[PDB]
Every structure is written in structure tokens, then in C-alpha cells.
């Protein structure tokens, strides 16, 4: 239906092999009451490009922040505390969140804490009446075949931490 939120975020790739390197791609994300979808962004024409994927909101089980990477590259470094800066808002993406569904977690990186908060609040609103909402989550990333939080080697492993 109507677009609730539209933003440019980094999306982390779904790791095929535990030894394989991770890719972070800049995409346009759209949220409606029915779907969360992501697209290539056509910078030159200033519009969304081809659709890369879509998740029916009814399939989402959890939306929360993720503990940040311990040694991120400059593109994902958190700035020191304290009017929108045009360059940084499309170049730096330090604030990650996770959208958990049928196929496991999707990791998305926001340029600001405020924008991450807006997306987590709205996603929690659209999923509020879902039937498979979980009570537990993984506070840390699934990286190189295991969760950094609990060392579990299954992506579908029940969250190690109870949601507050």
C-alpha cells in the first residue's frame, strides 16, 4: 500500500560459506504495511532501480538492534557523540539492526541512530499482530558459521537472550 518509510541502507550478504568474505551493499529499502522490500538505487536518475528482494511482513518474527562490529572499516565507524550532512548520510552506515524471518536474520546498517530507531519502531508496529513473534534473540551477528553471542552454529537456533 502507501510507503511508510524509504531509506538508503547497507545490506549485508547472506554468507554462502563460513570461510567466504562478506559483502555490504548500498540499497534502497521500502516499508509498507504488507511488505519490506529492497532495490538497487539508481543514483544518476535519483530513483529506485530493480527490485532485489521482498519479505511479507507476516513472516517477520523479530526486529531489534545488533551489537556493532568490533573493528569496522571507516564506512561503518560510529562517530563521537554530538542539520543533515549530505555526504555522510549516504557514505557512512554505523548503526546495524536485524530483521529475523523464515530464512534467518537480515542485517541492515543505518547512517544514523534516529533513522534506525524510526525503522525499528515502524517494523515493530507492522509486525505487532504476527503469529510467530519470538521472545528471544541473538544480540550479536551470525559471522563465519556461528553467532558471536552464544557460539551456536545453526542460523535458526533459538535466540540466546530473552527480549526485555
**Smallest distance from ligand 72V to CB 125, Å:** 25
Nearer Cβ to ligand 72V (52/155): 52
DSSP letter (8 states) at residue 86: T
When CB distances are held under 5 to 8 angstroms depending on the partner's kind, the choice from ligand 72V, Zn ion, none that residue 23 binds is: ligand 72V
When CB distances are held under 5 to 8 angstroms depending on the partner's kind, the choice from Zn ion, ligand 72V, none that residue 11 binds is: ligand 72V
Q: Judged by CB under 6 A, does residue 51 bind ligand 72V?
A: no
Q: Judged by CB under 5 A, does residue 138 bind Zn ion?
A: yes
The residue written with cell numbers 536518475 in the block is: 45
Q: Judged by CB under 6 A, does residue 76 bind ligand 72V?
A: no
Distance CA 111, CA 49 (A): 20
Which strand ranges, in their side-by-side order, compose the sheet holding 95-101?
47-56, 35-42, 24-31, 5-12, 104-110, 95-101, 62-65
35, 52, 124, 155: residue in contact with ligand 72V (rule CB under 6 A):
52
Q: Judged by CB under 5 A, does residue 150 bind Zn ion?
A: yes
| Entry field: residues in the chain | 164
Distance CA 6, CA 3 (A): 7
Count other C-beta atoms under 10 Å from residue 60's C-beta: 21
Q: Which residues bind ligand 72V (CB under 6 A)?
A: 11, 13, 23, 25, 52
Amino acid at each position: 500500500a502507501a510507503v511508510i518509510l524509504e531509506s538508503i541502507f547497507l545490506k549485508r550478504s547472506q554468507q554462502k560459506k563460513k570461510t567466504s568474505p562478506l559483502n555490504f551493499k548500498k540499497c534502497l529499502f521500502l516499508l509498507t504495511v504488507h511488505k519490506l522490500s529492497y532495490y538497487e538505487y539508481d543514483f544518476e536518475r535519483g530513483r529506485r532501480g530493480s527490485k532485489k528482494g521482498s519479505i511479507d511482513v507476516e513472516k517477520i518474527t523479530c526486529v531489534e538492534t545488533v551489537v556493532p562490529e568490533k573493528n569496522p572499516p571507516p564506512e561503518r565507524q560510529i562517530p563521537r557523540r554530538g542539520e543533515m550532512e549530505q555526504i555522510s548520510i549516504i557514505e557512512r552506515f554505523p548503526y546495524p539492526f536485524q530483521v529475523v524471518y523464515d530464512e534467518g536474520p537480515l542485517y541492515v546498517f543505518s547512517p544514523t541512530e534516529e533513522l534506525r530507531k524510526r525503522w525499528i519502531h515502524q517494523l515493530k508496529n507492522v509486525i505487532r499482530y504476527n503469529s510467530d513473534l519470538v521472545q528471544k534473540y541473538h544480540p550479536c551477528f551470525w559471522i563465519d558459521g556461528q553467532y558471536l553471542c552464544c557460539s551456536q552454529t545453526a542460523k535458526n537456533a533459538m535466540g540466546c537472550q530473552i527480549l526485555e
